[PDB]
Amino acid sequence: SPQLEELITKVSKAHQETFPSLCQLGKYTTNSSADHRVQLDLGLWDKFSELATKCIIKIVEFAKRLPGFTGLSIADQITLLKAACLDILMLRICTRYTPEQDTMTFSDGLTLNRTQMHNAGFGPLTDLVFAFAGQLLPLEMDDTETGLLSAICLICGDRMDLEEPEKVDKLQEPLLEALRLYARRRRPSQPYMFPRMLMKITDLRGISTKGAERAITLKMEIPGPMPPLIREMLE
């Protein structure tokens, strides 16, 4: 129980220090391709892809602050990150959804409307991502819960080509315990919150699978290769 309490705050702090809250950010806008959907606005793609690269690095930084992660083999660390990074990217942007404005906000404050998200590369996946974001709102998750959920998504023993899946399973166990404890303590009158959060991982996997599919078609729309850390994620 003291050890579990420390795990909660280690993960929470790792999340917050690699992922500013919507409240913390100085929002700004762009007038690029703001009012009609097009196949791709390359200026929006360039900026979005640069921001995704930076957030990938931040997810690696987050991962390495999770207790036990750096005790996994370097191969397993890489395997886990490649399997989960798109999921965590999508969860991250969807936690920065402002429903009143139908916008999402990136880590530098860039705030895009739905049409600009489409035009930045989401394309035919845009409305499904926004729907996921919409359906996260009734959970009213806080940063600690988002951080713990992200950690549970990453540290999972089912990933293909893991060398030591039992070791990964044992690292996941206390994260599950921590999220249940935290979530029930915070909102004891809503006991379905923990299982609803866990089921969002499945939903997330669905949309990340579609995101990988979208990456294949986007690759045909852009004039060069995707940034190298994005290619690492997608392989």
Ligand X SMILES: CCCCCCCCCCCCO[C@H]1O[C@H](CO)[C@@H](O[C@H]2O[C@H](CO)[C@@H](O)[C@H](O)[C@H]2O)[C@H](O)[C@H]1O
Contact residues: ligand 156, CB under 6 A: 49, 51-52, 55, 89-90, 92-93, 106-107, 121-122, 125, 211, 214-215, 218, 230, 234
Q: How far is it, in rounded angstroms, from Cα 198 to Cα 180?
A: 10
Q: How far is the CB of 71 from ligand 156 (least distance, A)?
A: 27
Residue 85 interacts with which of ligand X, ligand 156, none, CB < 5 to 8 Å by class: ligand X
Does residue 56 touch ligand X according to CB under 6 A? yes
Find which of ligand 156, ligand X, none residue 215 binds, CB within 5 to 8 Å per kind.
ligand 156
Q: Which residues contact 106 (CB under 8 A, 6 or more apart)?
A: 48, 51, 55, 93, 96, 112
Residue 42 vs 51, nearer CB to ligand 156: 51
Q: Does 82 bind ligand X (CB under 6 A)?
A: yes
At residue 225, φ and ψ (nearest 5 deg) are -65, 155
Binding piece for ligand X, criterion CB under 6 A, among 49-57, 132-140, 157-165, 214-222: 49-57
One of 61, 140, 163, 221 touching ligand X (CB under 6 A) = 61
Do the beta carbons of residue 192 and residue 104 sit within 8 Å?
Answer: no
Q: Which positions lie near ligand X, rule CB under 6 A?
A: 54, 56-58, 60-61, 78, 81-82, 85, 229, 232-233
